[PDB]
Design an enzyme around this catalytic site. Structure first.
Site, PDB file in Angstrom:
ATOM      1  N   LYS A  21       8.036 -16.601  41.583  1.00 37.69           N
ATOM      2  CA  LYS A  21       6.845 -17.233  42.144  1.00 37.69           C
ATOM      3  C   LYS A  21       5.737 -17.311  41.106  1.00 37.69           C
ATOM      4  CE  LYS A  21       7.813 -15.441  46.795  1.00 37.69           C
ATOM      5  NZ  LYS A  21       9.249 -15.210  46.468  1.00 37.69           N
ATOM      6  N   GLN A  40       5.205 -10.130  50.463  1.00 37.49           N
ATOM      7  CA  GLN A  40       6.629 -10.176  50.171  1.00 37.49           C
ATOM      8  C   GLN A  40       7.401  -9.359  51.199  1.00 37.49           C
ATOM      9  OE1 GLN A  40       8.606 -11.734  47.073  1.00 37.49           O
ATOM     10  NE2 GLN A  40       9.561 -11.702  49.111  1.00 37.49           N
ATOM     11  N   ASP A  42       2.936 -18.873  53.415  1.00 36.69           N
ATOM     12  CA  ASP A  42       4.297 -18.797  53.938  1.00 36.69           C
ATOM     13  C   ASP A  42       4.460 -19.539  55.261  1.00 36.69           C
ATOM     14  OD1 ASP A  42       6.355 -17.553  52.416  1.00 36.69           O
ATOM     15  OD2 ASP A  42       5.489 -15.560  52.792  1.00 36.69           O
TER      16      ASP A  42
END
Lengths: 290, 288
Positions: free
Chosen positions: B50, B94, B117
């Site tokens: 990322k 995460q 997300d």
């Protein structure tokens, strides 16, 4: 001949149970659940529908009040009245009858109702919780279909279910529940294998999916026809009755093939109203807990 | 043999587009989009990927490392500070997070406007009623791959294997939905959702009937050659360490018309869509 999945008689059973459960909860020191139904305009069919909700509220011990508004009400005026009901602690549930003028954005209306009082379950927060398979307020017609399957002992776990119709208010919540995982916190877990068919599914593919289905649910507002050659012997056929109104099933012939079927009329309307009462009671309990 | 859908190369193409569009937007008087990634515990490699793509496209990324015994209130206070931090445009946690951490509460603690997300219940709810939203990145990757590789979906038979709230559910939602609706992401396919309780016989029958199979279960060798329709498109979202996907790759490649490899397929596209989402959120916040 198929078993008859008579939603009218089932709704009566459900309303009798709700009457008892509400009285027990009131007896613990709670006010009876309250619902406010906002009616915009003078559509004679929208008034019949609201009177049915009020009559079922009276039956089960819910206190219902109808707020009538004129067809020319502005969106700002409608949202202002909803926000007032949002802040009124004497109101547990808020419904807006769902033929609202083209002036008013229906999406803004749905999302203006406090999720905790959103008896129709159309607020994006309530839909979001449904779709991640979490406890929420579930749309009433979808809940009615799911309740018809559970009460008539129709096996869903690992069975092939076809839902014809993808509408956000009805077809989508039905499909979402039908493939819910029971283990999840929501508990509305049916664990069927679900195919979503819709307006652009080719006819021959739709027929093939239906022939292999243990359960067919017709929720679309567009004319479909379930014919006997589309039905697996012993399958369960539920016509939601979305459409003035018509039926989506060749009842006489399909009744000779299916294992269980909605009659004509199916009683899904009365089942929807009973589930609205369930949702009002559910909301009143949640608010009293918090 | 199957056409190999090179997700790595498509992701590079998309990242080069993003790099240009971000620089143009910055040049109008805007700060580059910023992202904070929170990791709890050890393994991080995803986060390396990322942060590498963010640097490539012009996004400013910082990683916040926390030890595995952080409490929920601490993690939620960390998220709240980032919500109120006007220098932060995007926040990710995460996942996996420890079982003492309630995932749903953490997802809803991120401000929806910064929720790169797309896991906040508000962002999910908008997805499910076909409104513009921040779309979960792996699901958006699958939809963008179907479009960019010119895989026809209209009225086609599709199977999605897996119901996961973050991946399987949003894929099936967009795949079957109406493109005329406001989000414009619907693909108008007929969609069967298969899952862990689909009996094996019925699973194979739906797969053999499908023009598109999208599998996101994390069960290696789930999709076998005798389950695949000749010419079908196979999108393999699973990633299991033995890194393999859910498909018997070398055998299914003899039957399928098109297949994504693992690695090099959906994975790089997921990261590129995370960059897409960060640029989207930064633009929305500047416009508001």
């Amino acid at each position: 001949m198929a078993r008859i999945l008579d939603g009218k008689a089932l709704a009566m059973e459900i309303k009798k149970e709700l009457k008892q459960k509400i009285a027990q909860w009131v007896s613990l020191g709670n006010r009876a659940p309250t619902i406010r139904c906002i009616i915009v305009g003078d559509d004679p069919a929208s008034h019949t529908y609201v009177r049915n909700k009020v009559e079922a509220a009276k039956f089960v011990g819910i206190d219902a009040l109808t707020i009538n508004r004129d067809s020319d009400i502005t969106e700002e005026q409608l949202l202002s009245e909803i926000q007032n009901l949002n802040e009124d602690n004497s109101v547990d549930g808020i419904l807006v009858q769902l033929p609202v003028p083209d002036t008013i954005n229906e999406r803004r209306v749905c999302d203006a109702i406090a999720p905790e009082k959103d008896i129709d379950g159309f607020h994006i927060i309530n839909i979001g919780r449904l779709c991640v398979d979490l406890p929420t307020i579930v749309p009433a017609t979808a809940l009615a279909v799911v309740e018809m399957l559970k009460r008539f002992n129709i096996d869903t776990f690992g069975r092939n279910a076809v839902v014809i119709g993808r509408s956000k208010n009805v077809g989508m919540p039905i499909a979402m529940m039908l493939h819910s995982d029971k283990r999840h916190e929501s508990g509305l877990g049916m664990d069927a294998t679900v195919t979503i068919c819709h307006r652009y599914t080719p006819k021959d593919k739709l027929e093939a999916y239906c022939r292999n289905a243990d359960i067919i649910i017709t929720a679309t507002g567009l004319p479909k026809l379930i014919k006997a050659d589309m039905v697996k012997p012993g399958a369960t056929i539920i016509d939601v009755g979305i459409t003035r109104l018509v039926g989506d099933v060749d009842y006489e012939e399909v009744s000779k093939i299916a294992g269980a079927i909605t009659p004509v009329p199916g009683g899904v309307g009365p089942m929807t109203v009973a589930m609205l009462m369930h949702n009002t009671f559910q909301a009143a309990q949640s608010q009293a807990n918090k």
